Amino acid sequence: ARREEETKEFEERVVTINRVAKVVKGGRRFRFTALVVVGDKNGRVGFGTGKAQEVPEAIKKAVEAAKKDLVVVPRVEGTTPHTITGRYGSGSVFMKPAAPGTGVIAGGPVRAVLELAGITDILSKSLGSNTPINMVRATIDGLQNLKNAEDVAKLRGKTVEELYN
Amino acid sequence: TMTDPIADMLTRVRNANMVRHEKLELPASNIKKEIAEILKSEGFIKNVEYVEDDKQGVLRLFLKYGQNDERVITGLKRISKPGLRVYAKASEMPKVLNGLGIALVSTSEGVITDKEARKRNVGGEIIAYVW
Amino acid sequence: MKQLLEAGVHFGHQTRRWNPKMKKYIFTERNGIYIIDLQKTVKKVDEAYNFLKQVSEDGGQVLFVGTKKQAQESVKSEAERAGQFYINQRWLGGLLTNYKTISKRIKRISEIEKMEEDGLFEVLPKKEVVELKKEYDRLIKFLGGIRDMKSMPQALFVVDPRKERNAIAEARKLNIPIVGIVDTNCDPDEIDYVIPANDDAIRAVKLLTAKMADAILEGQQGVS
Amino acid sequence: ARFRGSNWKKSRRLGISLSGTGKEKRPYAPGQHGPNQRKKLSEYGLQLREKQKLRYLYGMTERQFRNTFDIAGKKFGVHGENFMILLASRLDAVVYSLGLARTRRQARQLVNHGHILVDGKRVDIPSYSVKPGQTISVREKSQKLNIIVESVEINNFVPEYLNFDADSLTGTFVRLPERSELPAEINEQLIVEYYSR
RNA sequence: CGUAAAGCGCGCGUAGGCGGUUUUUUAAGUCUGAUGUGAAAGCCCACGGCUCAACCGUGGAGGGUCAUUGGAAACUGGAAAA
């Protein structure tokens, strides 16, 4: 799925909609769609999508698949640990942490994302493609390949506070 | 003909991480063993064991992995490479990945991590990031 | 459990093509065919036997696939012996990741059958009775006699990966304990709990279904 | 055009009390099409609506508002806080937030007048930046007209970073405030994002 | 830079660019320290005055592929030996 939990708080939030067609002889059968992200803005977020003949159906189905895929998102000081670049299918992306008091600076979709994972001050510029989907998949690809000081110094035989960001 | 040894070492290393078998072989050199000791001091390595025969090498390494088998680095590369050599001061140096990884560097007094190079206020010729 | 003279029984696998992941299991290839080594196998049997036994300590629930032939007679048999639900044939789309339907499925069973009491067969005309009888028989058939999974599984046992690779991946979405027999020509790291021994042989599979039926049964008559 | 507007219709749009003036019809929104359903909100509308929701507070304008914002761009600690406190460490605020009025504009016509005396000195501009280690007074000539002591008498409120002497009409600024010391609290992040694009 | 614009038809070879290992040395490159200079005004930071601001001043830091000079030798470089 993997492991939707409906137990935390939630804030569904919508990114787009298309009107998408399948032509069969005679008419043009088309099916509105939408992407969604869902998080607690307290340490959990993930996307979800679906298609239907109508919006409420689509968005709801999207949300039922939305909770089913998640990332833990190691956050620190209301901020991400460090800077990366995400990449997936030419929808590259670049983040960087910040002096606080800034507020998230980025584009529409990615703003809706990180605003829903409870991150406060961070800097970015989207890159490569402007398509809404693989943008996000870039984001969560990077956040899935991301670490905090406890995630690491465990591995290395030494320990934090001779080393820290 | 090998234009560069850094490529040999770091590429056999990455190619060995993507496949996850522990041990690995390579012809030796002065700098290679120096930095390999640093990586052992990082924690990115378990162990090394030198061995000798006609004439160089083989600097044999045994790599390290979690119990859940996550690769301990994510990434790697040099910087100071042929054609465009590069340098940096003691003040100017980078703090990679705001503090997690490292940036190997050579000094007038030896090859070291970047941290000892800013504490000492001695810069030098950078070699490689790793993180 | 295991003893090495029970591992003098297990022999060989198929020799068409073989995962290079699994040379570590090999003792050495001879007579034109690959074998697995056995000294490790006993350790792994101990560890896994112990694991599934622990899953039965907590009041566990477990599945048996027999969709592979030359196994099924031992699958419902050793499963019904242990007293856990089973399958020995068709794994239709979803039974571990399509939960929302299985309710309707076994509920279809409990629905149609009882009406054989209040007057069903040859009280309604030729056209329906002939339909429902066949629906019932094929239902039980390509399902099996399972009607009992009411809380969805928390561990699985299986006859063979490379046939049921689909179903075990449907477990992989459910990040569960998987365990089962390992022909040397199957995805090794697709399961956390290998049992590196042959699958084709009747005595091998009977022995493994037998002992694992025993470990389960112990853990279930273990205070659950 | 610092202030010549109704200034109620604005607070009818945004969903805040003031300003102004006073406190039915507020569940609606302005205009012919007003009462009905309307557009949704973009992200832009939120940070923007926040901006105006701080702008018509002090009645000021944008070119002054920005210049404030980026003189907060110099100093250390967080940013939006410094913009708030420096925006409410002004002369109109230290007047009305001391309780010498019923609204924010009463202070403005009080000080263009020159009635108050920053450190015992005539000043005609509400755009002064008030500081600690000061007094503030009322041109003792005029501490008895209809408006003032009509307003002085009631204890509207007092923050602990302001002192006050109702007998003397003497305030004096005390500590660096924060929003947790300043009512009419906000979000800062949304408005700082607005001056990105 | 397979197919979307984009690898010459292919070769011989000059000039140039890049260069295996160990040891010893040199100090041009490099790093570091200092002396001078890098006008003033301006930019940025701190302060004070024009009622505040603009503005003005003060003082700070800042800036060179810069010259001179004392130190370090792992790396590039030159010389020598294997």
Coordinates of N, CA and C (backbone and C1' of nucleotides) in Angstrom, one line a residue, chain E residues 20-74:
Chain E
rG20 P 51.2 10.5 -13.5 O5' 51.6 9.1 -14.0 C5' 50.5 8.2 -14.3 C4' 50.9 6.8 -13.8 C3' 51.7 6.7 -12.5 O3' 50.9 6.9 -11.3 C1' 52.5 5.1 -14.1
rU21 P 51.5 7.7 -10.1 O5' 52.6 6.7 -9.5 C5' 52.2 5.4 -9.1 C4' 53.3 4.6 -8.6 C3' 54.3 5.2 -7.6 O3' 53.8 5.2 -6.3 C1' 55.5 4.1 -9.3
rU22 P 54.2 6.3 -5.3 O5' 55.7 6.0 -4.9 C5' 56.1 4.8 -4.3 C4' 57.6 4.6 -4.1 C3' 58.3 5.8 -3.5 O3' 58.2 5.8 -2.1 C1' 59.5 4.9 -5.4
rU23 P 58.3 7.2 -1.4 O5' 59.8 7.6 -1.6 C5' 60.9 6.8 -1.1 C4' 62.2 7.2 -1.5 C3' 62.6 8.7 -1.2 O3' 62.9 8.9 0.1 C1' 63.4 8.0 -3.4
rU24 P 62.8 10.4 0.7 O5' 63.9 11.2 0.0 C5' 65.3 11.0 0.2 C4' 66.2 11.9 -0.6 C3' 65.8 13.4 -0.6 O3' 66.2 14.0 0.5 C1' 66.3 12.7 -2.8
rU25 P 65.5 15.4 1.0 O5' 65.8 16.4 -0.2 C5' 67.1 17.0 -0.3 C4' 67.3 17.7 -1.6 C3' 66.6 19.0 -1.8 O3' 67.3 20.0 -1.1 C1' 66.3 17.7 -3.8
rU26 P 66.5 21.3 -0.6 O5' 66.0 22.1 -1.9 C5' 67.0 22.6 -2.8 C4' 66.4 23.2 -4.1 C3' 65.3 24.2 -3.9 O3' 65.8 25.5 -3.6 C1' 64.6 22.6 -5.5
rA27 P 65.1 26.4 -2.4 O5' 63.8 26.9 -3.1 C5' 63.9 27.5 -4.5 C4' 62.6 27.7 -5.1 C3' 61.6 28.6 -4.3 O3' 60.8 29.3 -5.2 C1' 60.7 26.4 -4.3
rA28 P 61.3 30.8 -5.7 O5' 60.6 31.0 -7.1 C5' 59.2 31.4 -7.2 C4' 58.6 30.9 -8.5 C3' 57.1 30.5 -8.3 O3' 56.3 31.7 -8.4 C1' 58.2 28.8 -9.5
rG29 P 55.2 32.0 -7.3 O5' 54.1 30.9 -7.6 C5' 53.6 30.8 -8.9 C4' 52.8 29.5 -9.1 C3' 51.8 29.3 -8.0 O3' 50.6 30.1 -8.1 C1' 52.8 27.3 -8.6
rU30 P 50.2 31.0 -6.9 O5' 49.9 29.9 -5.8 C5' 48.9 28.9 -6.1 C4' 49.0 27.8 -5.1 C3' 48.7 28.2 -3.6 O3' 47.4 28.4 -3.4 C1' 50.5 26.6 -3.8
rC31 P 47.0 29.7 -2.4 O5' 47.4 29.2 -1.0 C5' 47.0 28.0 -0.4 C4' 47.6 27.8 0.9 C3' 47.6 28.9 1.9 O3' 46.4 29.2 2.5 C1' 49.7 27.8 1.9
rU32 P 46.2 30.7 3.1 O5' 47.4 30.9 4.1 C5' 47.4 30.2 5.3 C4' 48.6 30.5 6.1 C3' 48.9 31.9 6.5 O3' 48.1 32.4 7.6 C1' 50.9 30.9 5.8
rG33 P 47.6 33.9 7.6 O5' 48.9 34.6 8.1 C5' 49.6 34.2 9.3 C4' 50.9 34.9 9.6 C3' 50.9 36.4 9.2 O3' 50.2 37.2 10.1 C1' 52.9 35.4 8.5
rA34 P 49.6 38.6 9.7 O5' 51.0 39.5 9.4 C5' 51.8 39.8 10.5 C4' 53.1 40.4 10.0 C3' 53.1 41.7 9.4 O3' 53.0 42.8 10.3 C1' 54.5 40.3 8.2
rU35 P 52.5 44.2 9.9 O5' 53.6 44.7 8.8 C5' 54.8 45.3 9.1 C4' 55.4 46.0 7.9 C3' 54.4 46.9 7.1 O3' 54.1 48.1 7.7 C1' 55.8 45.6 5.6
rG36 P 52.8 48.9 7.3 O5' 53.0 49.3 5.8 C5' 54.0 50.2 5.5 C4' 54.3 50.3 4.0 C3' 53.1 50.7 3.1 O3' 52.9 52.1 3.2 C1' 54.1 48.9 2.1
rU37 P 51.3 52.7 3.3 O5' 50.7 52.4 1.9 C5' 51.3 53.1 0.7 C4' 50.9 52.4 -0.6 C3' 49.4 52.4 -0.8 O3' 48.9 53.6 -1.3 C1' 50.3 50.3 -1.2
rG38 P 47.4 54.1 -0.9 O5' 46.4 53.1 -1.7 C5' 46.6 53.0 -3.1 C4' 45.8 51.8 -3.7 C3' 44.3 51.8 -3.3 O3' 43.5 52.6 -4.2 C1' 45.3 49.6 -3.0
rA39 P 42.1 53.1 -3.7 O5' 42.4 54.6 -3.1 C5' 43.6 54.9 -2.6 C4' 43.7 56.2 -2.0 C3' 42.4 56.8 -1.3 O3' 42.3 56.3 0.0 C1' 43.3 58.4 -2.8
rA40 P 40.8 56.0 0.6 O5' 40.1 57.4 0.5 C5' 40.5 58.5 1.2 C4' 39.8 59.7 0.9 C3' 38.3 59.6 0.9 O3' 37.7 59.5 2.2 C1' 38.9 60.8 -1.0
rA41 P 36.5 58.6 2.5 O5' 35.3 59.1 1.6 C5' 34.8 60.5 1.8 C4' 33.9 60.9 0.7 C3' 32.7 60.0 0.4 O3' 31.7 60.2 1.3 C1' 33.8 60.5 -1.6
rG42 P 31.1 58.9 2.1 O5' 30.5 58.0 0.9 C5' 29.6 58.5 0.0 C4' 29.4 57.6 -1.2 C3' 28.8 56.3 -0.9 O3' 27.4 56.3 -0.6 C1' 30.6 56.1 -2.4
rC43 P 26.8 55.4 0.5 O5' 27.1 53.9 0.0 C5' 26.6 53.4 -1.2 C4' 26.9 51.9 -1.3 C3' 26.6 51.0 -0.1 O3' 25.2 50.7 0.0 C1' 28.7 50.4 -1.0
rC44 P 24.4 50.9 1.4 O5' 25.1 49.7 2.3 C5' 24.9 48.4 2.0 C4' 25.7 47.5 2.9 C3' 25.7 47.8 4.4 O3' 24.5 47.2 5.0 C1' 27.9 47.6 3.7
rC45 P 23.9 48.0 6.3 O5' 25.0 47.8 7.5 C5' 25.4 46.5 7.9 C4' 26.3 46.5 9.1 C3' 26.0 47.5 10.2 O3' 24.9 47.2 11.1 C1' 28.3 47.7 9.7
rA46 P 24.3 48.2 12.1 O5' 25.5 48.8 12.9 C5' 25.9 48.2 14.1 C4' 26.7 49.2 14.9 C3' 26.1 50.5 15.2 O3' 25.1 50.5 16.2 C1' 28.3 50.9 14.6
rC47 P 24.0 51.7 16.3 O5' 24.9 53.0 16.6 C5' 25.6 53.2 17.8 C4' 26.4 54.4 17.8 C3' 25.7 55.7 17.7 O3' 25.1 56.1 18.9 C1' 27.5 55.7 16.2
rG48 P 23.7 56.8 18.9 O5' 24.0 58.3 18.5 C5' 24.9 59.1 19.3 C4' 25.3 60.4 18.7 C3' 24.2 61.2 18.0 O3' 23.4 61.9 19.0 C1' 26.0 61.1 16.5
rG49 P 21.9 62.4 18.6 O5' 22.1 63.6 17.7 C5' 22.8 64.8 18.1 C4' 23.2 65.6 17.0 C3' 22.1 66.4 16.2 O3' 21.8 67.6 16.9 C1' 23.5 65.3 14.7
rC50 P 20.4 68.3 16.7 O5' 20.3 68.6 15.2 C5' 19.2 68.1 14.4 C4' 19.2 68.8 13.1 C3' 17.9 68.9 12.4 O3' 17.2 70.1 12.8 C1' 19.4 68.0 10.9
rU51 P 15.7 70.4 12.5 O5' 14.9 69.3 13.4 C5' 15.2 69.1 14.7 C4' 14.3 68.1 15.4 C3' 14.3 66.7 14.8 O3' 15.3 65.9 15.4 C1' 12.1 67.5 15.1
rC52 P 16.3 65.0 14.5 O5' 15.3 63.9 13.9 C5' 14.9 62.8 14.7 C4' 14.1 61.7 14.0 C3' 14.7 61.2 12.7 O3' 15.8 60.3 12.9 C1' 12.4 61.5 12.4
rA53 P 16.9 60.1 11.7 O5' 16.1 59.8 10.4 C5' 15.5 58.5 10.2 C4' 14.8 58.4 8.9 C3' 15.6 58.7 7.7 O3' 16.4 57.6 7.2 C1' 13.6 59.9 7.5
rA54 P 17.9 57.8 6.7 O5' 17.7 58.6 5.4 C5' 17.1 58.0 4.2 C4' 16.7 59.1 3.2 C3' 17.9 59.8 2.6 O3' 18.6 59.1 1.6 C1' 16.1 61.3 3.1
rC55 P 20.2 59.0 1.7 O5' 20.7 60.4 2.1 C5' 20.6 61.5 1.2 C4' 20.9 62.8 1.9 C3' 22.3 63.0 2.5 O3' 23.3 63.3 1.5 C1' 20.7 63.7 4.1
rC56 P 24.7 62.6 1.6 O5' 25.4 63.3 2.8 C5' 25.4 64.7 2.9 C4' 26.0 65.2 4.2 C3' 27.1 64.5 4.8 O3' 28.4 64.7 4.1 C1' 25.6 65.0 6.5
rG57 P 29.5 63.5 4.0 O5' 30.1 63.5 5.5 C5' 30.6 64.7 6.0 C4' 30.8 64.6 7.5 C3' 31.7 63.5 8.0 O3' 33.0 63.8 7.8 C1' 29.7 63.6 9.3
rU58 P 34.1 62.6 7.6 O5' 34.1 61.8 9.0 C5' 34.4 62.6 10.2 C4' 34.2 61.8 11.4 C3' 34.9 60.5 11.5 O3' 36.2 60.6 11.9 C1' 32.6 60.2 12.2
rG59 P 37.4 59.9 11.0 O5' 37.3 58.4 11.4 C5' 37.5 58.0 12.8 C4' 36.9 56.7 13.1 C3' 37.2 55.5 12.2 O3' 38.5 55.0 12.4 C1' 34.9 55.5 12.7
rG60 P 39.2 54.0 11.3 O5' 38.3 52.7 11.3 C5' 38.3 51.8 12.4 C4' 37.1 50.9 12.4 C3' 37.2 49.7 11.4 O3' 38.0 48.7 11.8 C1' 35.0 50.7 11.4
rA61 P 39.4 48.4 11.0 O5' 38.8 47.4 9.9 C5' 38.5 46.0 10.3 C4' 37.2 45.6 9.7 C3' 37.2 45.1 8.3 O3' 37.7 43.7 8.2 C1' 35.4 46.5 8.6
rG62 P 38.8 43.3 7.2 O5' 38.2 43.5 5.8 C5' 36.9 42.9 5.5 C4' 36.2 43.4 4.3 C3' 37.1 43.5 3.1 O3' 37.2 42.3 2.4 C1' 35.9 45.5 3.4
rG63 P 38.6 41.5 2.2 O5' 39.0 41.9 0.7 C5' 38.1 41.6 -0.4 C4' 38.1 42.7 -1.4 C3' 39.4 43.0 -2.1 O3' 39.6 42.2 -3.1 C1' 38.4 45.1 -1.3
rG64 P 40.6 40.9 -3.0 O5' 41.7 41.2 -4.1 C5' 41.4 41.5 -5.4 C4' 42.5 42.1 -6.2 C3' 43.8 41.3 -6.1 O3' 43.9 40.2 -7.0 C1' 44.2 43.6 -5.7
rU65 P 44.0 38.7 -6.5 O5' 44.1 37.8 -7.8 C5' 45.0 36.9 -8.0 C4' 45.9 37.2 -9.3 C3' 46.8 38.4 -9.1 O3' 48.0 38.1 -8.6 C1' 45.5 38.5 -11.1
rC66 P 48.6 38.7 -7.2 O5' 48.2 40.3 -7.2 C5' 48.5 41.0 -8.4 C4' 49.3 42.3 -8.1 C3' 50.6 42.0 -7.5 O3' 51.6 41.5 -8.3 C1' 49.6 43.9 -6.5
rA67 P 52.8 40.7 -7.7 O5' 53.8 41.8 -7.0 C5' 54.8 42.3 -7.8 C4' 55.6 43.4 -7.1 C3' 56.6 42.9 -6.0 O3' 57.8 42.5 -6.6 C1' 55.3 44.7 -5.1
rU68 P 58.5 41.2 -5.9 O5' 59.0 41.8 -4.5 C5' 59.8 42.9 -4.4 C4' 60.1 43.3 -3.0 C3' 60.5 42.2 -2.1 O3' 61.8 41.9 -2.2 C1' 58.8 43.5 -1.0
rU69 P 62.3 40.4 -2.3 O5' 62.1 39.8 -0.8 C5' 62.9 40.4 0.2 C4' 62.3 40.1 1.6 C3' 62.2 38.7 2.1 O3' 63.5 38.2 2.5 C1' 60.2 39.7 2.6
rG70 P 63.8 36.6 2.4 O5' 63.1 36.0 3.7 C5' 63.7 36.3 5.0 C4' 62.9 35.6 6.1 C3' 62.7 34.1 6.0 O3' 63.8 33.3 6.3 C1' 60.7 35.2 6.6
rG71 P 63.7 31.7 6.0 O5' 62.7 31.2 7.1 C5' 62.3 29.8 7.0 C4' 61.0 29.6 7.6 C3' 60.2 28.4 7.1 O3' 60.6 27.2 7.7 C1' 58.8 30.3 7.1
rA72 P 61.2 26.0 6.8 O5' 60.0 25.1 6.4 C5' 59.3 24.4 7.4 C4' 57.9 24.1 7.0 C3' 57.7 23.2 5.8 O3' 57.8 21.8 6.2 C1' 56.2 25.0 5.7
rA73 P 59.0 20.9 5.7 O5' 58.4 20.0 4.5 C5' 57.2 19.3 4.7 C4' 56.5 19.0 3.4 C3' 57.4 18.3 2.4 O3' 56.6 17.4 1.6 C1' 56.9 20.5 1.6
rA74 P 57.2 16.0 1.1 O5' 56.0 15.1 0.8 C5' 55.0 14.8 1.8 C4' 53.6 14.8 1.3 C3' 53.4 15.1 -0.2 O3' 53.6 14.0 -1.0 C1' 51.9 16.5 1.1

